[PDB]
Design a binder for this molecule. Structure first.
Ligand SMILES: COCCNC(=O)c1cc(-c2ccccc2)sc1N
Ligand code: NA
Lengths: 315, 317, 329
């Protein structure tokens, strides 16, 4: 189709996925391609059991029901099995024990571990100590790689020229709301800036985007000669914010409540993403508007997570 | 006719016992009996593989959850469990509509228990996938009524005949005001040729609304008389000529002993949704009239039946 | 030797106490456990017990034993309903254990049960129509810990099984011997063989007399008892002298009236391992907190991580032996 695969599978076998930076251009292509294969299989109610005989541990040490249920659905649909650790925090699970000991032991029982922990540190220790691959399901640095991949998958389906890399093939996107703490913005901003992309950061002063992320965007745009001083624009209101943008990404939380009113002066092709849950940021009326795709976006998580597990754990 | 009735039930939500009509009950009771023999003969039970369900229990209800999960696993399917949360810890903020719109894109079907009447209704509205109610706050617990009715049908199969000469009599005993298990089953029974002895204390008398549904449904099949519904204060009169004694829970006055079972019909059988406390004495467990343990066991066979009928995309023998 | 006979003996066996496991059964277990070790280490199919549906009831947080038992059930190719993050009272609610187990056992092929209550597990076996494996209770009965403890020893010193007057194993149990009920269970299993014991403790945490009496009784039964069969020490220097196995116990803040009582007398270092036999191996049921230093993990005498890993293989063996329908693969 585009790139070799099956030597990309060889490259991904037993790979830990902690940060979106652990995923290079070829791996992204395998994932996006594999994700699309699982989409059609499931949409045709065909056999999905392409990874059996595998037993995974799911460790969720913060309530994050939707990501856990996603990862469990992916594991079960591939025809594998999973033991769950759940409804506990960092302290009830470790009790006394060091993370290093806990992961050294847990990794002798299972083929791989899905790990969510508020602590940035704990996931890094867990990779140090685990004899088995770990997928980060979310931590405290805002590394949530599988959210980036399904965010990117969703975009790719409506605008596949993001992948084509060409000063012609330029996508514009507006991130809106809490840009300081929207770690989902940061992770995706990082993946996007590898391609021909422009950014409208719509925030209220105290929640402006961090400079560290601006510098990574700038660095990565320059690497592919897609950077200009018109690559990044800041806005204080939705009016101007929501303009010539192919994607509107709303963050969790306000100042910016998306209505059918405020979507009147957007491109006709604009699509609206939201990692969810929404609390007020997007009004129920918008759900009917064919520009909204946040529910397809959540659905895509299944197909992407199946792809990632198949690519890493298949023998 | 299975390849008609199955086709009618495919992707059906079961929220209330009135979502189950005459022919659906017959498919269920027939399929339930097939799963009974298969399991009792240690034969292959994997009639529904490659299916992934979500079980959401937002109230501690271990027996029903374990039942539904056993059924899903024994049919050869898989299940993600949501558990030890209440309405607020799950939905940490999120609308039920969003939560079910998303969750239903991951799974083939959902078993949902929630104290809230409202939530289950919203869940059906928003879900792209079938829901089976495992219990809510309206007292809709359909699968309990089905296994209650399954158990009765095994000892007295003429309830299904609707024959003016083959009437079943049953005594419901204990908390009839709040025993919504009584209400759901009373509703299913009154569709057939059945008579009711309500044995209660004043403040726990059966509600008027239930009496009107019984009356309505008896009349519908011309099985109604003034001796269709009899009220009692005591077991001696209560247990008179009753084929079934259904004891209720309490959250005492009516304690079933071997004494109180002496002047019952020989064929009388004793049901109890469980758990019991002091309403039935351990001595009665030995008495061959008691079937409350077989009744809980029947829930596996009925829940398997209902899942197979709804989710199946070689009909079982 | 004769697995076709011993498997037939174990089919539908409940395993509550290490005394429910006799000589022949131990040998089936140790033999089967070693088969599952190689299968898993060769990435071969391990699905020797499919179409089985188990309930795992954990009514105290004991996450490592539960995850172990879950891994074993899943790797054998079977399925499990989990009860978890409950205590005796939130589960049961009103209900009698007898009713609860009479019902639960009609749904499933077998039950893994952990409950602090000694009583509850006994009632559960009496009422259950289906086999129960005790995963740990309040009498200190934790049979699967004994078996994997003994499995690990047997791999480094297989002459424990020979019961040969001239091939005696010596072992040091170290730390909390009063409350280390892991020591008690294993002491009981070991004393059936040609074994000698160094109990290394602080006065307050000396081994209980009733355990010493069982050891003494069981050694005498096989004519392996002497006055040098059981030696007490206060210190590691004498403790660790000529011992093939050093078993470190846990020290659990709980069991101690107050935080002050807790304060960590016997800390195994590379220093303290200088005057041990060359072949000595170090076990620890885990988790550790301070009693073994991280430096020791590199020292080739340490096997406590292999020991935890062995629990998968032993739990697979035990499930396969007990639940496999009239099987021979
Ligand atoms: C972080 O480590 C958790 C404990 N891991 C374990 O080894 C474990 C759990 C148990 C336990 C531990 C303390 C108090 C009561 C029971 S028994 C067992 N196999
Ligand atoms: Na499970």
């Amino acid at each position: 189709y585009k790139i070799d695969l099956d030597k990309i599978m060889t490259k991904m076998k037993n790979k830990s996925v902690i940060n979106i930076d652990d995923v290079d251009d070829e791996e992204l292509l395998a994932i996006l391609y594999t994700s699309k294969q699982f989409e059609k299989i499931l949409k045709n109610n065909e056999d999905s059991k392409y990874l059996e005989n595998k037993v995974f541990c799911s460790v969720f040490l913060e309530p994050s029901t939707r990501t856990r249920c996603s990862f469990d659905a992916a594991i079960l649909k591939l025809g594998s099995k999973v033991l769950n650790i759940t409804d506990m925090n960092s302290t009830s699970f470790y009790k006394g024990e060091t993370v290093e000991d806990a992961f050294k032991i847990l990794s002798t029982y299972v083929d791989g571990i899905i790990y969510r922990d508020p602590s940035k540190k704990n996931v890094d220790i867990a990779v140090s100590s685990s004899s088995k691959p770990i997928i980060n399901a979310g931590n405290g640095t805002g590394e949530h790689p599988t959210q980036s991949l399904l965010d990117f998958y969703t975009i790719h389906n409506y605008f596949p020229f993001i992948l084509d890399r060409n000063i012609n093939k330029k996508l514009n996107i507006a991130f809106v709301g809490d840009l300081k703490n929207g770690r989902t913005v940061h992770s995706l901003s990082k993946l996007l800036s590898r391609y021909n992309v422009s950014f409208n950061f719509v925030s209220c002063k105290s929640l402006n985007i961090p400079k560290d992320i601006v510098n990574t965007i700038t660095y990565n745009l320059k690497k592919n000669n897609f950077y200009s001083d018109d690559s990044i624009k800041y806005f204080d209101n939705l009016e101007e914010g929501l303009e010539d943008v192919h994607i509107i990404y709303m963050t969790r939380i306000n100042a910016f409540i998306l209505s059918n009113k405020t979507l009147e002066n957007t491109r006709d092709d604009t699509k609206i993403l939201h990692p969810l849950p929404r609390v007020n940021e997007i009004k129920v009326e918008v759900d009917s508007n064919p520009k909204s795709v946040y529910f397809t976006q959540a659905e895509n998580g299944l197909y992407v997570r199946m792809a990632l597990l198949y690519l890493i754990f298949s023998s």
